[PDB]
C-alpha cells in the first residue's frame, strides 16, 4: 500500500471522516483520489478553515481534521489556534510541505523550520524524516489532539511522500485505543469527597472543559446534592451548567479582587474544568479572602501548575465530576434559590439596545439553540438573558481572538444540524472572518448570523474611558453594509433598524432553508 | 518580605531543602544568606551538578533543586539534562541572569533568549516578566517538574530581583496540593482486569517508571496473580523487579525483531511504565507477531502517541499497579519457574572478565546494594549476574549519555546513606564527569566507583564490529591512571590485576568510611 | 558515489582536513572508511572536543570541524558553543542521528527536535530531509560559519544517509567560493574618513574581531595616523594590538560608567571590532559623555542592533582596517607615549603573587609565545604585565564560560605548532574540562598549562564582598592535586611552591617535549 491509503485508512479506523481545508499545490498528493467516504469542507482562507473545524470539533467533542496550504496557509491561520490552545480544542492541522528534493534549496513554498512555525500554539508539532514515516507521525498526531489536555497539533508533510511505500507494519496503527479517562485514587478521592461533606458553605465554579466533557448533568447532582452556588469561572468559552438551574450564579467577573469578594465567606471552592483564574482586568487585591480554601479539578497541568493558591488534582473531567456526583452527600442544607429575571431595559421605535436583542433572542429561538458570541462589549449582558437548558449551547473566543464566532457557529451548525445556531457577532469582529459566510452558502449550513452594529469597538471605547485615555486612533469602524457583504457571499440578507423588524427579521431567518445573516441597528 | 525570602520559604514549604550548584556571579544574590536549614551541594562542572541531582532525585522518589551559572553552566549541564528527559527526573533546574538594566546592551553573562536555551530537554522553561512573579514562576517549576509525566524545568531569574519586595499574596503558594496520582475510571478499569483474566499466556513488561513510583511490589503480586512472565522493558533506566523472583526473564534485547519473537505466542502483553520500546540497534521485522495484543499503561501521553502498536492509558503508574495488583483473579495456571543461575565464566590469574567481576559484587556486595552501570559493552550480563531485591537497586543513563553514572552514583548514596552503592563504569565513560569525584571526597559520600578498565570504548568497537565498518578513528583510550584521577580529587584509590585483588580491594572497599575507586583491569 | 564520498569532497575541497571529536554509534557510519588524508582528534568529552576544536579555529583564522555523539554529546558541549558564539568562531558542529526508521518511535539515541537542541547559540541548525540533501547541507553549514559575522552552525544527520546514493549534481558544490570581504561605500567611507581626520582628539577601541580578522597591523598603522590613543574593549577574548606600542593604553573596565569618563574629553571614538560594549559589573551612568561622539565598525548586526549609543557600519573588520589606515591622513599631533612599566610587587619566599607568575612568564617566555587565560580574579594584571607583540596572542572564554582555556589551549597549539602556548587557569576553572589533558598527552601537543592554585572561587569571593554578600556557599575548592590529575592523564607535572621552584619549573616546562602541567601555589 502506500503511504496515502495508509494515511487515510489510519483517519478512517480512528473515526475521521471530514477534511477542513483550503488546498495549495503542496496538498494536492494528499488530496487527490480524495476518499468517497470522506467529506471535504472547503472555506475561502485559513482563519476562516481553522475557525469551522474548531466549533465542529467543540460540539462534536472529537477530533477535526485541518489540511492547510504550506506555511502560508498556517500562518493565516495562527489567530484562529491561539484560541484553539486556550478551549483544549483537539485539532490535527496538517499542512504540505515540497518536494524532499527541493527543500534544501528553499524552493517557493518550502514551509521553512516547519515545525517551530505554529509554536508555541500547539501541544505537538512535526515533519516527519521518510515517507514511511508519515502514517505513524499521523497516529502520533490525532493522539497528541485527543489525549487529556486535549488541543491543537501540527505535521508537516512533503508533497512526494504520498506516493511512496508505506511499512506494512503500519496495520498497528488503525484500531489502538488510547485512553486518558482517569481520576483521583480512592484513598485521595475520599478525603477530597469528606472534605467537601463536610464544608459548611460550599461553591462550585465551572469552566469549558466540563462543558467539553458533557460533565454538565453530572455538576447539576453535584450542585444539587452540596446544595451549592455554581459560577462559570471568568472569560468563558463555553457554557458549563444549565442557566437557569436554581443554582446558577452566572458568569464571574474577570477580575482578582471582583472574585475573592464574591467568594468570600464560601469555606470550600470547588473549581472543576477552568484555569484558576482567566482574569482579564487588572483588578488587583486578595486572590482568596481568608476563610476560603480552592481545590480545582483540571485536566490541563498547565493550569494546575500556573493557579497561585488552592491545591489542585489533575485528571479527567468527565471522570471526576461523574466520580463526585455520585460519591458526595446529599446536604441537608436549603437549595440556593433562582436569580431572578433581568430587567427589561427601555425600549424606544428606534436603534436596538443589546438587552433588547437577547430578550428577544431568548423569547424566539427554540430552547435547543446554539448560541456564539463575539459581541464583545454585550457579554454580560447576554450571559444574564439566555436561557441554556443544555450543554454544548455556548461559545466565545477562548484566548479572546477576534474571527472566530463567524466560522465556528458554521463548524458547530455542521456538528449539531438539528440544533439552531445563532452567532451574536459585533460590527467590528464580523470583518476578520467574513469569507467564512462563503462556506455556510456553498455547503447550505444554515447558520443564522446576528450582526450588532454599532459603527465602533466598543469594547476598547470603553477600555480607553476606564484608562482616561485621550486620542486613541483606530477605534471606529464606519461605512460597513453587511447586507452587501452576506449577497456578496451568497447569504440571505435581512436588516432591522428597530424591535418591529428585528421580530420580522428573526421569524424570517428561523424559518428559512439556508444561512441567513441580519443586520441589527444597535445602540452606540 | 523579599523575593529572596519569600522564594526559599516557598522551597522549605514544598519539601526543597537542598542546592546542588556550581555557583557564578549571577546567582550570588540567590545564595547570599543561604537558610541555615538549607543543604549546598558543590560540584565541579554542571553535569557533575546535574548528576549528581539527578541521582538524589531519582532515589528520593522527590524533586531536587539545582542552581547553575547562567548561560555556560546550563549548557555544560544540557547531556545531563538529555538523561533526566528520559528518565522522568523531577529536576528544577533555576540559573541566574544578568541585572535587568543589563540584558538589553548584551552585557558578559547575559543568557540570550534563556527559555530556549535547554529545549527540547525541559517540560517547561521560562523567565519572569518582573521581580514579583519570580515566587509564583518558582512554584509553577516545582509544580510542573513533580506531576507526571515528571521531568526537568527550568527557571532563569535575573539578580536584582532577589532583594525587591515579593507579593503579599504570595503566601497563598506556599502550602499548595498538586496531584496527579490518577487511574483509570472503574467501567474500563474493569474491563481491562476481564481481559488480564481471561489471558491464556499474558505476559508483563515493566520499565522505570515502575521502580520511580516504588510500585514494584504492588506488580510482583500482579505477575504472581497473573502467573505471567515479567520482562524489563529494553535500554532500561532502572530496575522494577526483584530480578530472582521466579517471574523475571530478565533484560528484553532492544530490537524491532528481538521483541516480538520473545513475545510470540503471549495472548495480553501487559507493558507498565515504560515506552513501547526504547530499542536501539536496528533490527527490522514485526512490531508484535500475529496473535499478540499489547497494552500499554504510560505516565506519559508522549510516550501513548508514539508507540507504533497496542493500546494505552495514561495514568499515574504508583495508583494502576496498585489497582490492577489487588483487581486481577489469582490464576490457576502454574507459577512461572524461576531462570537458572548464570555460567560462570573460565577466569585465569590475569585481567578480569567483566562477568567475573559481576559475580565478585554479587558474592560479596550487601543485599540492599544500590548499582549505576555506565559499563556499555557488559550490560547484559550485570543484568544477569546481579541479585537486586529490592526497588531502588539499579539506575542506568537513560538517554545513553555517558557522564552521568559517576556523579548520580554520588547523589544516590546521598539520598540512601544506608545502602552501600557501587558504581560500575566503563574507563571511557569514566573521563566524561570525572570531576564530580571531588564532591564524593569533600562531604565524605562513600560511594565506591569500580572503573572497568580495558582501555577501549568496547561497544563502539563492537558495533564497528556489526557495520563490517574499516578504519573508523577514535576508538581507543589508553594511557589513563585511574589511581592518579582519584588521588587528584581526595578519593582513596585501588587497583585490581587479578581476581585475588579484586577480593581484596572489594574487602577494603566495603569497610571503608569514605568513597573508594578500584581500578580493575579487564579483558580486551 | 555516495553521500559519504561527496561529503568529505566537499569538505577537502573546502579546506577542512581534520575532525574534532568523540565518537558515538550514530556517527560511526560517519567516521568508518575515514580519508587518508584527514585527521581525527579525539577529545574524552564534548567540552574538551569543541573546546579544542574552537582554539584551532581561532588562532588558524579558518572553520573547524566538529562531530558529537547526537543529543547528549552536542548537549555536554553546549557550554562550550556559549563562548564560541560571543567570539564569532567559525565551529561547523555535526552531531549524528538514529536511522531514518527509528527516529519515529524514538529509538535510544534519537535526537529529538535536534535542530532545537543548540539554539539559541549558533547560527545555523538543521536536519536534512533526506540523504541526498546531505551533501548540500554541509555546504551550507561550511558557508553559514565562514561568513561575516562568524560563528558556530549544527547539523544533524541520520546515520543511514551516509551509503545513500548521493546527487551527482553535488559537484557543483565543491569548488563555491562565498565572499563577506566588504567594506563601507567610497562616498560614505570618505565621510568617515574626513571625521576622523578631524577630530582634535580621537581615541580607538578595539575588540576581538580585529584580531580574527589579522587586522592588528592595520590598526597600528590607522592609531599611528591619528596619533590615537588604542584600548581593548572591555572582557577582551583577544588581544587586537601590541600591548607595549606607545599607542596602548591597555584594557578598559567592563563598566559603563568607568568607560564614559575614561572616553571623556575624546571628540571622535572609534570602535573596531567590538561589541559596544561588553560591560559586566553594574556601573550605571552615562554611556558617553557629552561631547564625545561614538562611531562603530562592527562584522556583527546584532552588535550595530543593541549598541545603546554611537553611529555603525556593518562590514568584514580585515577590509574596513585595511582601507582605513590607507586613508587617513597623518596628523601632525604627537605620538602618544607608552605606558610605564608596571611595578614590581612585593615577593617573599613563600606563595606566589600573580603579579609575580606574570612577570616571570614575561621574562622567560618566547616573544611569540601564546597566552590564554581563565584565572579569572588575575586578568587585569596579566594585561598589564604580558608584552604581547604579535596577533594571536591571547584568548579568554567570550561568554565568561569556565572550561575554555584548557582545551582551546591544545586547539592553538595545535594551531601553531611553532609558537609556545602558555594556558594561565584558576584550580577552579582548571576542573571543569580537565580530561583535556588527555588529548595533549596522546597527539604530544606541548602546551604549558599553569594552574594557579590558592584554593578558592577568587573571583566570586571578591564580588561577593562587594555586594557585602555574607554566607554564600559554594565558593572554596580546597583538596585537589593537581600533578595527580597530570598524572592521571599523562602530562608530565611539576609544583612552584615559591618564586625559585617557579623559575625552575618554567625552565624544565620551555624545554619539555610534550605538554607540562605546572601547578603554582599562589596567595589567597
Ligand atoms: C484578532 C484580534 N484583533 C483585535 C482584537 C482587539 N479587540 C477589538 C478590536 C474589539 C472590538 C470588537 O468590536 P465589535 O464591534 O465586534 O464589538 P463591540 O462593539 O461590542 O465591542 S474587542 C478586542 O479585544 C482582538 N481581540 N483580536
Ligand atoms: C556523551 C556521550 N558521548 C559519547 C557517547 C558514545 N558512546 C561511547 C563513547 C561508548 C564507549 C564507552 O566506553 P566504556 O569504556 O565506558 O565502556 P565499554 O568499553 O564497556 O564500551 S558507548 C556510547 O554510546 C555517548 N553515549 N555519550
Ligand atoms: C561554566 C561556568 N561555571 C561557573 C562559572 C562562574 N565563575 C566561577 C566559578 C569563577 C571562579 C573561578 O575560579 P578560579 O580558581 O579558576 O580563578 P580565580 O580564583 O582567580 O577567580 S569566575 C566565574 O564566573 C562560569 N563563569 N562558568
Ligand atoms: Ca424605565
Ligand atoms: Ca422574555
Ligand atoms: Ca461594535
Ligand atoms: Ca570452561
Ligand atoms: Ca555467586
Ligand atoms: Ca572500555
Ligand atoms: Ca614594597
Ligand atoms: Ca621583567
Ligand atoms: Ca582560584
Ligand atoms: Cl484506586
Ligand atoms: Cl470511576
Ligand atoms: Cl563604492
Ligand atoms: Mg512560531
Ligand atoms: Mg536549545
Redesign the interface.
Same mark, same amino acid.
Given at each position: 500500500a502506500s503511504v496515502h491509503g495508509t494515511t487515510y485508512e489510519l483517519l478512517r479506523r480512528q473515526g475521521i471522516d471530514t477534511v477542513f481545508g483550503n488546498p495549495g499545490s503542496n496538498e494536492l498528493p494528499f488530496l487527490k483520489d480524495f476518499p468517497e467516504d470522506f467529506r471535504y469542507i472547503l472555506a475561502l482562507q485559513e482563519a476562516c478553515v481553522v475557525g469551522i473545524a474548531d466549533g465542529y470539533a467543540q460540539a462534536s467533542r472529537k477530533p477535526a481534521f485541518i489540511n492547510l496550504a504550506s506555511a502560508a496557509g498556517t500562518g493565516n491561520a495562527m489567530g484562529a489556534l491561539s484560541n484553539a490552545w486556550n478551549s483544549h480544542s483537539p485539532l490535527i492541522v496538517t499542512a504540505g510541505q515540497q518536494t524532499? +528534493?527541493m527543500?534544501? #534549496?528553499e524552493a517557493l513554498l518550502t514551509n521553512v523550520?516547519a *515545525?517551530?512555525l505554529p509554536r508555541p500554539l500547539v501541544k505537538?508539532s512535526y515533519?516527519?524524516?521518510?515517507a514511511?514515516?508519515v502514517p505513524? +507521525?499521523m497516529?502520533?498526531a490525532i $493522539?497528541?489532539a485527543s489525549? *487529556?489536555p486535549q488541543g491543537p497539533v501540527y505535521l508537516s508533510v512533503?508533497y512526494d511522500d504520498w506516493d511512496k511505500d508505506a511499512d506494512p !507494519?503500519?496495520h $498497528?496503527?488503525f484500531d489502538?485505543? #488510547?485512553?486518558?479517562?482517569?481520576? %483521583?485514587?480512592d484513598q485521595?478521592l475520599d478525603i477530597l469527597v469528606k472534605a467537601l461533606n463536610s464544608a459548611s458553605n460550599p461553591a462550585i465554579v465551572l469552566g469549558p472543559d466540563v462543558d467539553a466533557a458533557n460533565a454538565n448533568a453530572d455538576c447539576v447532582m453535584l450542585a444539587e446534592r452540596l446544595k451549592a452556588p455554581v459560577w462559570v469561572a471568568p472569560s468563558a468559552p463555553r457554557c458549563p451548567f444549565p442557566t437557569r438551574h436554581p443554582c446558577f450564579r452566572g458568569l464571574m467577573p474577570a477580575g482578582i479582587a471582583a472574585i475573592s469578594q464574591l467568594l468570600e465567606g464560601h469555606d470550600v471552592v470547588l473549581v472543576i474544568g477552568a484555569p484558576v483564574f482567566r482574569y482579564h482586568q487588572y483588578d488587583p487585591g !486578595?486572590? %482568596?479572602k481568608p476563610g476560603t480554601r480552592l481545590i480545582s479539578v483540571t485536566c490541563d497541568?498547565?493550569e494546575?501548575?500556573?493557579?497561585?493558591?488552592?491545591? +489542585?488534582? #489533575?485528571?479527567?473531567i468527565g *471522570?471526576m465530576a461523574?466520580?463526585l456526583a455520585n460519591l458526595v452527600e446529599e446536604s441537608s442544607r436549603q437549595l440556593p434559590t433562582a436569580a431572578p429575571e433581568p430587567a427589561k431595559v427601555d425600549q424606544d421605535a428606534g436603534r436596538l439596545h443589546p438587552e433588547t436583542v437577547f430578550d428577544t433572542l431568548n423569547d424566539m429561538a427554540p430552547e435547543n439553540a446554539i448560541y456564539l458570541n463575539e459581541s464583545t462589549s454585550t457579554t454580560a449582558q447576554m450571559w444574564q438573558r439566555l436561557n441554556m437548558r443544555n450543554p454544548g449551547s455556548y461559545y466565545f473566543c477562548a484566548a479572546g481572538g477576534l474571527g472566530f464566532a463567524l466560522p465556528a457557529a458554521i463548524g458547530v451548525q455542521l456538528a449539531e444540524p438539528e440544533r439552531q445556531v445563532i452567532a451574536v457577532i459585533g460590527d467590528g469582529s464580523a470583518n476578520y472572518s467574513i469569507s467564512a459566510l462563503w462556506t455556510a452558502a456553498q455547503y447550505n449550513i444554515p447558520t443564522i448570523f446576528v450582526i450588532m452594529n454599532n459603527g465602533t469597538y466598543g469594547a476598547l471605547r470603553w477600555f480607553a474611558g476606564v484608562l482616561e485615555a485621550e486620542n486613541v486612533p483606530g477605534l471606529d469602524v464606519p461605512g460597513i453594509d453587511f447586507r452587501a457583504l452576506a449577497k456578496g457571499y451568497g447569504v440571505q440578507a435581512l436588516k432591522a433598524d428597530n424591535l418591529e423588524q428585528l421580530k420580522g427579521s428573526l421569524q424570517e431567518a428561523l424559518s428559512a432553508k439556508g444561512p441567513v445573516l441580519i443586520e441589527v441597528s444597535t445602540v452606540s
Open positions: 524532499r +528534493a527543500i534544501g #534549496v523550520d *515545525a517551530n505537538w515533519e516527519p524524516a521518510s514511511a514515516e505513524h +507521525a497516529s502520533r $493522539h497528541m489525549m *487529556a512533503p !507494519q503500519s $498497528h496503527l489502538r485505543h #488510547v485512553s486518558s479517562s482517569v481520576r %483521583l485514587n485521595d !486578595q486572590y %482568596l497541568p498547565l494546575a501548575a500556573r493557579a497561585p493558591m488552592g491545591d +489542585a488534582i #489533575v485528571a479527567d *471522570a461523574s466520580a
